[PDB]
């Protein structure tokens, strides 16, 4: 996904974009989803960067993923 | 509750109730074959449409398609085994040419009449219902029985009927 | 009673959740122990699966380890000095995991002489053990005073015991500054 916000402490919001297909009209829609991810101090991502995340045990009310790799800009 | 025995439907009414041409054509068949009601004709209509619908689907597929090979031979085999088509007809395109009288010819009621066991097609109907006809030593009382070509020569009078070695009006006359 | 489910919380959208089932036994919680310093008193609890948890209400003794020496000894608790959650827990002398306590230092001094031959065939081993070995000044000063700071490592409300480890290194200097 892509980094959407970095205002929390050691937590970021990422966004996933995809196209959904409607069978009746034979055409697509644009949709998106948001996730909260824990970000270790070993990384320094910025808004707009692309990250790779992995699933882990529940860490808070909304966090279920950890950042594994950052691809800058 | 919790009963899983299946059942379905075998006939459908025409969608124009009073069409002059259709009414006359159907009254021809009832008199010619001695049927009881229009429902017996409409039953034959559904079987033909099922066969023709299947054939159209297969003929769309390419010849080397596996499903066309297996289903195509299966439906042709069934048509030959029941006398709907003669063995000369081999391609799958000839099944689309089946008509209503083609199937009505194979009914047991019209088979026995043309075989010489009955004076008329109405005489054939009562004989079957009265347990006088046997197909391969088996009594059949269903006029709509469809006979197979390999079973045509086995049709004769039953062994328990007076007409062939039975009788184990005359029974009540002598008392 | 007390529950641990998320059904009563708000959604991230801020909207309210409409509940359509009753509370289940598989999501209960229980009241805290609030273990305090005093003469031993415990109460067993029957937990899921038929197992037992020991709920400690009062404790005054425990097992404490000297990490650099890789040994342990049973000593008495003297006081609770620091708690990172709240000052009210120090005031009431509440024993919870990771709080700082002061324990009796006499058994450690006694072991030091028997193992090193120092007072704050066997003689030859004592010379061997002394080689490449020194003692931190900060630890040594506490032993002469009679009390030494330690850190609780068990969970008294879950297991019913209060074990710990003596503070050394930079961790000791951190808490000494907070105390004064």
């Amino acid at each position: 996904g892509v980094v959407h916000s970095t205002k929390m402490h050691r937590t970021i919001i990422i966004r996933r974009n995809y196209l959904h297909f409607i069978k009746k009209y034979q055409r697509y829609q644009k949709r998106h989803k948001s996730l909260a991810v824990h970000c270790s101090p070993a990384f320094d991502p910025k808004q707009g960067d692309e990250v790779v995340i992995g699933q882990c045990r529940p860490l808070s009310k909304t966090i279920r993923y950890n950042v594994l790799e950052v691809v800058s800009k | 509750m919790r009963n899983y025995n299946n059942f379905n439907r075998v006939w459908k009414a025409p969608r124009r109730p009073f069409e002059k041409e259709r009414l006359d054509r159907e009254m021809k068949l009832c008199g010619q074959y001695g049927l009881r009601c229009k429902r017996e004709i409409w039953r034959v209509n559904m079987t033909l449409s099922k066969m023709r619908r299947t054939a159209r689907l297969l003929l769309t597929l390419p010849e080397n398609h596996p499903r066309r090979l297996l289903e195509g031979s299966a439906i042709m085999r069934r048509c030959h085994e029941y006398g709907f088509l003669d063995e000369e007809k081999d391609k799958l395109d000839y099944v689309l040419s089946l008509t209503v009288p083609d199937i009505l010819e194979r009914r047991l009621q019209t088979i026995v009449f043309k075989a010489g066991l009955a004076k008329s097609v109405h005489h054939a109907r009562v004989l079957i219902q009265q347990r006088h006809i046997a197909v391969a030593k088996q009594i059949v009382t269903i006029p709509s029985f469809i006979v197979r070509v390999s079973s045509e020569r086995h049709i004769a009078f039953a062994d328990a009927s007076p007409f062939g070695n039975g009788r184990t009006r005359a029974k009540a006359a002598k008392r | 009673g007390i529950v641990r489910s998320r059904l009563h919380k708000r959604k991230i959208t801020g909207g309210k959740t409409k509940i359509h089932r009753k509370r289940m036994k598989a999501e209960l919680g229980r009241l805290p122990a609030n273990t305090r310093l005093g003469a031993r008193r415990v109460s067993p609890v029957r937990a899921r699966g038929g197992n037992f948890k020991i709920r400690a209400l009062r404790l005054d003794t425990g097992n404490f380890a000297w990490a650099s020496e890789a040994i342990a000894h049973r000593v008495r608790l003297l006081d609770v000095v620091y708690n990172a959650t709240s000052n009210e827990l120090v005031r009431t002398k509440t024993l919870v995991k990771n709080c700082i306590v002061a324990v009796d230092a006499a058994p450690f001094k006694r072991w030091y002489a028997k193992h090193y031959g120092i007072d704050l065939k066997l003689q030859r081993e004592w010379t061997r053990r002394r080689r490449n070995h020194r003692v931190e000044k900060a630890i040594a000063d506490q032993l002469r005073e009679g009390r030494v700071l330690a850190r609780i490592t068990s969970r008294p409300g879950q297991s019913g015991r209060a074990d710990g480890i003596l503070l050394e290194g930079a961790e000791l200097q951190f808490y000494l500054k907070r105390l004064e």
């Binding site: - | 919790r2 899983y4 025995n5 596996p66 090979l69 297996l70 | -």
Partner: protein
């Protein structure tokens, strides 16, 4: 919690008619999984026809007349499964539960002196108390001192009479395997290459005797011999070779015509 099993929900391989009753016998926990088993009451009644109903099935079983892996079983809900040996000494019967080429259970008759051997697949390895290595198999056995070269996925040749390991077959390229799950169940092939995907499922590429190629997940294979020519067990009469559906239909029709 669940104690019943509706007949419509039972596995299709048991061959139970939907019109006969509402229920089917629910197998107990045991050596084999519920979805991959054949309960004893089904074997003695619907398969061997020694019992006409459940009442007669109980008389035979509760007397201890049926042995599984050389041990009497008195429970009709016992979950028998793949590779087990069933003996009825009073009638001189010996079978092994296997899969035929269409994925159904098949009872292969066993000669004597080979009813003492069972193949087991290793599914886990761990250390017990006292540093004792232990291997746990697909049928729930625990072997407390396996061969040192054992690895997860290998096959152990086991003597049920004497309770001891006799040989080891390693999972390697060029061995003979049989498929135990999926759409290729019951087919016998030759390991061409195992593709490894960490985290995901590994994929095994196989090739039967005729040269046909197929694949499946690595957890569904079961080593049974060194090579396709020399197996370590007797397989059903198809030898695990799947034939074309059109060809099968023709031959069955031809044989039927010749049968009369």
């Amino acid at each position: 919690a669940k104690k019943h099993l509706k007949r419509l929900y039972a596995p299709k391989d048991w061959m139970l008619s939907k019109l006969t009753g509402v229920f089917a016998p629910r197998p107990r926990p045991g050596p084999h999984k519920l979805r991959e088993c054949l309960p004893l009451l089904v074997i003695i009644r619907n398969r061997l026809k020694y019992a006409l109903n459940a009442r007669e099935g109980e008389m035979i079983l509760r007397q201890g007349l049926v042995h599984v892996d050389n041990h009497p079983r008195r429970d009709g809900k016992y979950p028998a499964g793949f590779m087990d040996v069933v003996e009825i000494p009073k009638t001189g019967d010996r079978f092994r539960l296997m899969y035929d080429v269409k994925g159904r259970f098949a009872l292969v008759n066993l000669s004597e002196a080979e009813a003492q051997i069972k193949l087991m697949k290793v599914v886990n390895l761990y250390t017990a108390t006292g540093r004792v290595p232990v291997a746990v198999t697909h049928d729930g056995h625990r072997i407390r001192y396996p061969d040192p070269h054992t690895s997860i996925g290998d096959t152990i040749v086991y003597n049920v009479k004497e309770k001891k390991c006799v040989d080891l077959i390693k999972n390697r390229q060029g061995k003979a395997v049989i498929v135990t799950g999926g759409a290729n169940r019951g087919r016998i092939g030759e390991i061409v290459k195992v593709e490894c995907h960490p985290g995901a499922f590994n994929i095994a590429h196989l090739k039967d005797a005729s040269g046909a190629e197929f694949a499946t997940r690595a957890a569904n294979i079961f080593v049974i011999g060194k090579d396709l020519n020399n197996l370590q067990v007797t397989v059903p009469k198809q030898q695990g070779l799947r034939m074309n559906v059109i060809q099968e239909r023709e031959e069955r029709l031809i044989a039927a015509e010749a049968r009369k």
